[PDB]
Design an enzyme around this catalytic site. Structure first.
Site, mmCIF file in Angstrom:
data_model
loop_
_atom_site.group_PDB
_atom_site.id
_atom_site.type_symbol
_atom_site.label_atom_id
_atom_site.label_comp_id
_atom_site.label_asym_id
_atom_site.label_seq_id
_atom_site.Cartn_x
_atom_site.Cartn_y
_atom_site.Cartn_z
ATOM 1 N N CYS A 233 3.781 0.471 24.064
ATOM 2 C CA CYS A 233 4.465 1.783 23.855
ATOM 3 C C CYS A 233 3.846 2.434 24.730
ATOM 4 O O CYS A 233 2.651 2.721 24.904
ATOM 5 C CB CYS A 233 4.503 2.255 22.369
ATOM 6 S SG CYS A 233 5.020 1.087 20.997
ATOM 7 N N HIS B 201 5.735 9.271 18.668
ATOM 8 C CA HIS B 201 5.349 8.482 17.443
ATOM 9 C C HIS B 201 3.839 8.165 17.589
ATOM 10 O O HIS B 201 3.424 7.314 16.516
ATOM 11 C CB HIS B 201 6.358 7.425 17.146
ATOM 12 C CG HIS B 201 6.093 5.995 18.041
ATOM 13 N ND1 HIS B 201 6.896 5.764 18.852
ATOM 14 C CD2 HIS B 201 5.018 5.086 18.238
ATOM 15 C CE1 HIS B 201 6.606 4.601 19.391
ATOM 16 N NE2 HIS B 201 5.453 4.334 19.096
ATOM 17 N N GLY C 251 1.423 -2.119 20.851
ATOM 18 C CA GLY C 251 0.597 -1.224 21.563
ATOM 19 C C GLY C 251 0.971 -1.315 22.879
ATOM 20 O O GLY C 251 0.338 -0.325 23.672
#
Ligand SMILES: C[C@@H](C(=O)Nc1cncc2ccccc12)c1cccc(F)c1
Ligand SMILES: C[C@@H](C(=O)Nc1cncc2ccccc12)c1cccc(F)c1
Lengths: 306, 306
Positions: free
Chosen positions: A145, A41, A143
């Site tokens: 991720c 993503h 952030g």
């Protein structure tokens, strides 16, 4: 003596974290050999997340749309592919700091260390468990991720988790390093249900053995019990049922303390039925299930890593 | 969201740990530039520890009696001196992995990360606080001596603790990196009394603000209080008295949540007088004091390190 929620040393993982940018989105990547792994993503905008068509989104992207930065070293992307929910970015430079590593899919109730990262840089390290409903109760901001969970065995880093998302309930979901989600979750911004979260009984028992090793013996009673009788009580309190495999795993702790596993279950039953009555165990007023039997042996014997 | 007892990433410290051997005793050392720092009781035997005369013991030792090993690299000792309770071993090779660093003497109630080591090799990392009685509630086995506590600020590692001993009560005592003990303890195997251990009130408040940031608001009441009235209640429960300096430090958390510090003290007072009544806060059934106000801001804003 003493007992702490101890994480693995993170140095071997810190040298593998890079920053991945695609358009306006920046998240963390894991750089091993000449491949960077990151959540797919990264190719989405804030609007795409409600219902992304990842294949259609990825087709409009070429190698030069991905900016991979390792501090001040710019890696050049020369190949890209989507493997389940992870993007694999082939770069021109193999990571010199690549450790001996493997990818592992852990089972619920196992524990690992998380290195929380932002913009490719380490922020902190903590230990946690995969819950029986395949979530983790982490500490993550926007952030984070692409931050990874790992164990260390001898000299080998076993990567087991990559962070993808926070559920509307505040718990966290992610994939293994092959991009398969743990649990029934999808990488889409929609309401998703995690199951009932049960307590990891074999971990609670290993922690009671840790308490005994450390001098906390008040919860020990004269009663005993049977596996069937204990599981009938355990399932009333949303505890995971105990199997013979769990009794075998606890054997070394039984030997070191001289307390039979079923005797420890009897003590646990009374703690379940009568509570802790304002007392504590290893500094805690709750029964703790984030230590595996291996975690306890490790900490109480002083296992080091190369 | 979420809240975890998070340690600093340890990679910068892992490269500084070496093994120090003197006779039959082996413990951990910290190798910065061309100096190795270690507990001076590396020069003692098991019998010497009851009443060591360190000066007389050190005089019978020459540079070649110390074996410093960094994995498979053997450092040669070319100078040695005793600074308070720390031995300083001058070696021929400056550590290439020396980070930007400083030595700091922390004050009680501040927190730091511990890298627990055995034989010069990292075993695990955890966060803890210096108690008001100058002990730490650590997790240490025989041979962990010389393991260090540290913080990270930007790119600079601040070393603040070196582990020396376990008291007969199971808590831990050590020195700063200039070899001055924290607290009234001496490096001798004799019964020693630590004072009353009080709760770090300013830390408890910062943690209640963390709970509010994370959605736990049930403990918030309509009452308020005064600093003098709160301290009268706090001192009955062995809580550290709150000063105006503490109120100033909590200001940013007050601003972010919109809850005045004295209003938070009022909530805390009721928790002290009426308990938690079987509920939990941030997953805990006890009031937690191992998070400073800076720890909370760090974790809830995502501060990274280079
Ligand atoms: C945007 C991203 C996501 O949840 N990121 C986050 C991860 N961790 C913590 C967070 C805390 C606050 C805000 C966002 C956080 C996402 C959404 C939906 C599906 C998906 F695959 C990823
Ligand atoms: C021998 C050493 C010491 O206490 N080492 C230890 C440190 N940490 C944990 C331990 C756990 C078990 C056994 C020993 C442990 C010492 C004794 C007296 C004075 C002194 F300066 C040092």
């Amino acid at each position: 003596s003493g007992f702490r929620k101890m994480a693995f040393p993170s140095g071997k993982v810190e040298g593998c974290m890079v920053q991945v940018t695609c358009g306006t989105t920046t998240l963390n990547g894991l750089w091993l050999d000449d491949v960077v792994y990151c959540p797919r993503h990264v190719i989405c905008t804030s609007e795409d997340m409600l219902n992304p068509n990842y294949e259609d989104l990825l087709i409009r992207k070429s190698n030069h749309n991905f900016l991979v930065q390792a501090g001040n070293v710019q890696l050049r992307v020369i190949g890209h592919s989507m493997q389940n929910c992870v993007l694999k970015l082939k770069v021109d430079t193999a990571n010199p700091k690549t450790p001996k590593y493997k990818f592992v899919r852990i089972q619920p109730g196992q524990t690992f260390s998380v290195l929380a990262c932002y913009n490719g840089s380490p922020s902190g390290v903590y230990q946690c468990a995969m819950r029986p409903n395949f979530t983790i109760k982490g500490s993550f901001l926007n952030g984070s991720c692409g931050s990874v969970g790992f164990n260390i065995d001898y000299d080998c880093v076993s990567f087991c988790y990559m962070h993808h998302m926070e559920l509307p309930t505040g718990v966290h979901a992610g994939t293994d390093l092959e991009g398969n989600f743990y649990g029934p979750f999808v990488d889409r911004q929609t309401a998703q249900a995690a199951g009932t979260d049960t307590t990891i009984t074999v971990n609670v028992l290993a922690w009671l053995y840790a308490a005994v090793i450390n001098g906390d013996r008040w919860f020990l009673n004269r009663f005993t019990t049977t596996l069937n009788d204990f599981n009938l009580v355990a399932m009333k309190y949303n505890y995971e049922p105990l199997t013979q495999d769990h009794v075998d795993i606890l054997g070394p702790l039984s030997a070191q303390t001289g307390i039979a596993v079923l005797d420890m279950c009897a003590s646990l039953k009374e703690l379940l039925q009568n509570g802790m009555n304002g007392r504590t165990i290893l500094g805690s007023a709750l029964l703790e299930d984030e230590f595996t039997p291996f975690d306890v042996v490790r900490q109480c014997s002083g296992v080091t890593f190369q």
